[PDB]
Design a protein around this nucleic acid. Structure first.
Ligand code: MG
Ligand code: MG
Ligand code: MG
Ligand code: MG
Ligand code: MG
Lengths: 125, 207, 40, 170, 201, 103
RNA sequence: UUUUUGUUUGCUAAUGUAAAAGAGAAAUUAUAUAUGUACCGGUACAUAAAUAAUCCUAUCAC
RNA sequence: UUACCGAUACCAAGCCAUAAAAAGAAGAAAAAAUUUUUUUUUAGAAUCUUUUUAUGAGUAGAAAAUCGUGGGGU
RNA sequence: AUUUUAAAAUUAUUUGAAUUUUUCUUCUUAUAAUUUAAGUUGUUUCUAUACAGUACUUUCUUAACCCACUCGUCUUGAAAC
């Protein structure tokens, strides 16, 4: 269904799973568009899996915004933090998965100084 | 202030514009460009001394008599406490079924109307809305069981506005009670709770 | 015809009028109950 | 070992590396055992090796017969897998020994975890038909056994509502 | 259909219509005790009905008739079958609805003493012209090997006496009540009495 | 009398429907003694509450409720369509609903 | 059977309702007629005939 | 004869994309605090931004924009 | 950051006409405000005086209503016996 939270309208919380991904392990759920005569999904019979389509797209204005209302920015390094001193309300940091604990801490500290939200501050905590 | 477009004559109350909204390419601005909201306008039924059921609240089904149309729009109501148990209460027009019955159409009671009106006038809108401080105080008790409730009650009592309201209610009761008591059936009606039953179909009931 | 008119009256009643009737019935029941007791 | 334990001071373990017994039979035996006091399990195993009480074959029950003994476990089918029982008996003995070595009284010990996995099969050949070689593999198994010693938020409005409800009830 | 359990006196009703009425109610969610199902009627002639039922009977499963159309031939059971026909009984909801229906032949241990309702939309009196052939279901059932018809009739007869007895008592009670009312209208107040008179009582 | 009615009793039937298409945005409610379009129309704005019980407690209670508005009458026989804040589940399809006298 | 508190190592305290909000209602019978009552199926007299469009039952707290 | 129910068609409104169309190389707005502080924004990326309107089925096929893997220079 | 302006409309004033004699009669001379213009604003609760709870968001898991035939493939045509 539609998933309003505020101004964020999401048209489709459910992921589009590959057709028959449920039936055969070898067929992974990652959407693949069924070519092939007689597919039924391709043909869009009532009661089968839906086809992802551009109709489902989120409004241009709120698109990549998270529930926060902030665009996610991934950050590896203190230097990178600096671009978002002038955008501390619009963007929120995520610290890269590969950043070390000490470095992570440092980054978190910097973020606090900047007033910028960190979405994964708790990593290695 | 009022506007008279296509014969309606709508009546305009001056509203405040609280919500700020983010402007397109520079900074914030208040949402409501409009300054004067059209007034509620209650239905041709809600009078000044009619008995009415309270549909929704803790006092659910108690028949109480209407007191004041309260400018804000939602109105005041009393089951002159000592008769019915309903205090001086504010209620929306929607959570009331006003009956066809009127207190000031009985021959005994009708002569006490001016005083009642005066009393109603004495009541205000802001005398209901509880202030922040009181609320805060109430909240502060949540850091045994019945004791807490008692404390809350005490706090409620303490409020000056509440006290004033209580006084007003008492006055109203004094004014009204004896006559009501004397008209015994009416008193009983006032006391009793309105209920739907099998036979009372609701869509056919002109009450 | 009588029953029709009674029905009409019932339909057109005010809440208070309904309450009045209820009260009357209650009174009657009380009296009726007393008489039954006496009989027994 | 596959369990969650907390205090291994109260547990006694025991294993078999690559037992040359059939997985299915031994699995059945394990199933029959599990959640038994250790000594009782041992007794049961001894009975089955002397063909007095069956082990009921509930899961891997294709073709397995229809014994009189299976009534004891509300079932029709059962068997008396001897070799499997012997292997299992050995591992039970080992477990008991371990318990003794610790300070665990063997009366109070329950089998909390009797796991039988299948191990890598030994390969042999069988000869069929029109010059066709087929595998004739064993289905050996690992057995793990663990014996073990045995004997908010209020809110003001919500509160008010509750009170009102109580009053109404009264 | 907002009652807990409707008892339906199936006498004088037209099988199919009655069944239809029942089915919808059941679906909605309403226990229904179809009682006195010997006396349901069918709109054909008797012979015609028998023929139809004969045909139905004939359709068993060729291979193994333990399975396949069960020819339940107690009138109640026939009624039940009919009801089922008009329900989505292969679902869960449908099944539940079906379960909710109880059917009886004659009237037994609670359903003597429950009020018995009537579906006038499905009453033979109102639905067939009197120059049309109808048939009592019980008779039809008997013709097709039910047997317990006479017994049922006897039971019904027995029950009727009891009912009559009860009714006499009830009547007497009513009379007494009326008398009391008459007596005790005078003893109330005037205005109240007047009001009462105005609204019928 | 402990507790007062103050609602018309009702039965939450299926959803709005074709023969074999569902439309779970609307439910159909039967209101007790209302047999016609006209009579149904009396209720058209009234608020409807499906209250139901659960095993686990929630805000410290076993009862919860979903609210709806009664949108429109539903053809000739006094049934009404009711639109709920969150769609009602089909577990509900025989169940009692309370159609309040508010507004 | 009654009372209280509860069901907010695999476990060893323990929950589920396809339906409570008054879920009220026992003649029987015919449908171009019924039912009682009193006599000997018959006769005479009552009774129902929009029959749940009704009746019953609710609020009078301690 | 009415009334009704009834599609992914129709209608109204929203959002996505496509297509086309308008059109575009300088500035304080508000609220909250108590006259001064604090809070957000204070845009100008031409395959880009803003707005408009219409349209959206699809195998064989065609195209464009995206996504990802192994390695290279930066 | 000047087509959320302009005008329309409305209210309260002011000058001059009109035949629909009219507490909504119309136009127009001027002036202020307003919204019926110029796409929803307010009021009051609640979440809540909370740091996660049984509420809230979300994943999975079951049910239930309705629907749903084995994909690939050659084929006019495949759920295909
Ligand atoms: Mg094809
Ligand atoms: Mg296309
Ligand atoms: Mg299907
Ligand atoms: Mg061919
Ligand atoms: Mg195919």
């Amino acid at each position: 269904a539609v998933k309003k939270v505020g101004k964020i309208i999401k048209k489709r919380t459910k992921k589009f799973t590959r057709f028959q991904s449920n039936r055969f392990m070898r067929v992974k759920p990652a959407w693949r568009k069924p070519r092939g005569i007689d597919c039924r999904v391709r043909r869009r019979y009532k009661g089968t899996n839906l086809m992802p389509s551009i109709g489902y797209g989120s409004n241009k204005k709120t698109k990549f915004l998270l529930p926060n209302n902030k665009y996610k920015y991934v950050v590896k390094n203190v230097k990178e933090m600096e671009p978002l001193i002038m955008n501390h309300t619009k963007y929120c940091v995520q610290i890269a998965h590969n950043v070390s604990s000490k470095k992570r801490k440092q980054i978190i500290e910097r973020a606090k100084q900047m007033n910028v939200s960190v979405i994964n501050a708790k990593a290695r905590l | 202030k009022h506007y008279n477009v296509k014969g309606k004559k709508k009546v305009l109350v001056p509203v405040n514009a609280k919500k700020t909204i983010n402007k397109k390419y520079f900074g914030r601005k208040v949402a409501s460009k409009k300054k004067y909201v059209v007034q509620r306008k209650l239905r041709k039924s809600i009078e000044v001394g009619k008995v009415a059921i309270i549909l929704t609240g803790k006092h659910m089904g108690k028949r109480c008599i209407i007191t004041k149309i309260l400018n804000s729009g939602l109105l005041a109501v009393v089951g002159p406490y000592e008769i019915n148990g309903v205090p001086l209460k504010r209620v929306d027009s929607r959570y009331l079924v006003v009956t066809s019955t009127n207190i000031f159409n009985f021959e005994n009671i009708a002569k006490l109307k001016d005083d009642f009106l005066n009393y109603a006038q004495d009541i205000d809108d802001d005398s209901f809305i509880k202030t922040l401080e009181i609320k805060k105080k109430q909240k502060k008790l949540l850091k045994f069981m019945n004791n807490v409730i008692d404390k809350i009650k005490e706090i409620r009592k303490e409020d000056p506005k509440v006290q004033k309201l209580e006084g007003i209610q008492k006055d109203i009761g004094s004014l009204l009670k004896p006559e009501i008591l004397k008209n015994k059936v009416f008193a009983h009606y006032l006391k009793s709770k309105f209920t739907l039953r099998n036979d009372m179909v609701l869509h056919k009931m002109k009450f | 015809g009588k029953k029709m008119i009674i029905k009409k009256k019932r339909d057109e009643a005010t809440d208070f009028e309904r309450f009045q009737v209820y009260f009357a019935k209650r009174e009657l029941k009380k009296k009726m109950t007393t008489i039954k007791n006496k009989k027994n | 070992y596959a369990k969650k334990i907390r205090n291994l001071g109260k547990c006694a373990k025991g294993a078999g590396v690559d037992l040359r017994v059939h997985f299915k039979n031994t699995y059945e035996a394990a199933r029959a055992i599990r959640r038994m006091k250790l000594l009782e399990a041992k007794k049961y195993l001894n009975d089955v090796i002397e063909k007095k009480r069956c082990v009921p074959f509930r899961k891997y029950n294709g073709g397995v017969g229809r014994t009189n003994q299976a009534k004891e476990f509300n079932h029709t089918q059962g068997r008396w897998p001897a070799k499997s029982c012997k292997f299992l008996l050995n591992i039970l003995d080992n477990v008991q020994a371990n318990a003794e070595s610790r300070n665990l009284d063997v009366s109070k010990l329950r089998l909390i975890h009797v796991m039988v996995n299948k191990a890598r099969p030994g390969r042999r050949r069988t000869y069929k038909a029109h010059g066709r070689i087929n595998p004739f593999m064993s289905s050996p198994c690992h057995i793990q056994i663990i014996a073990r010693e045995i004997n908010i938020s209020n809110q003001n409005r919500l509160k008010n509502k509750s009170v009102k409800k109580q009053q109404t009830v009264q | 259909m907002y009652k807990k359990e409707y008892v339906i006196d199936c006498k004088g009703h037209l099988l199919g219509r009655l069944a239809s009425l029942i089915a919808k109610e059941l679906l909605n969610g309403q226990r229904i005790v179809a009682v006195r199902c010997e006396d349901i009627n069918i709109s054909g002639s008797l012979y015609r009905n028998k023929l139809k039922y004969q045909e139905f009977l004939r359709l068993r499963t060729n291979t193994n008739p333990k399975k396949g159309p069960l020819h339940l031939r107690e009138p109640s059971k026939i009624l039940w079958r009919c009801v089922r026909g008009m329900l989505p009984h292969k679902t869960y909801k449908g099944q539940l609805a079906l379960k909710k229906l109880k059917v009886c032949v004659g009237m037994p241990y609670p359903y003597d003493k429950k009020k018995k309702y009537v579906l006038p939309s499905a009453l033979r009196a109102f639905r067939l012209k009197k120059h049309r052939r109808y048939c009592r279901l019980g008779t039809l059932s008997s013709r097709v090997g039910w047997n317990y018809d006479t017994l049922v009739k006897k039971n019904e007869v027995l029950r009727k006496q009891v009912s009559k007895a009860y009714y006499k008592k009830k009547v007497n009670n009513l009379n007494e009540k009326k008398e009391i009312k008459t007596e005790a209208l005078n003893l109330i107040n005037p205005e109240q009495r007047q009001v009462l008179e105005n609204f019928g009582y | 009398l402990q507790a007062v009615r103050l609602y018309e009793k009702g039965v939450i039937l299926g959803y709005k429907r074709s023969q074999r298409n569902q439309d779970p945005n609307f439910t159909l409610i039967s209101i007790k003694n209302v047999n016609t379009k006209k009579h149904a129309q009396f209720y058209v704005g009234k608020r409807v509450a499906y209250v139901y019980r659960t095993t686990k407690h929630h805000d410290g209670v076993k009862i919860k409720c979903i609210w709806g508005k009664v949108c429109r009458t539903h053809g000739n026989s006094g049934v009404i369509r009711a639109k709920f804040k969150t769609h009602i589940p089909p577990k509900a399809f025989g169940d009692r609903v309370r159609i309040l006298m508010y507004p």
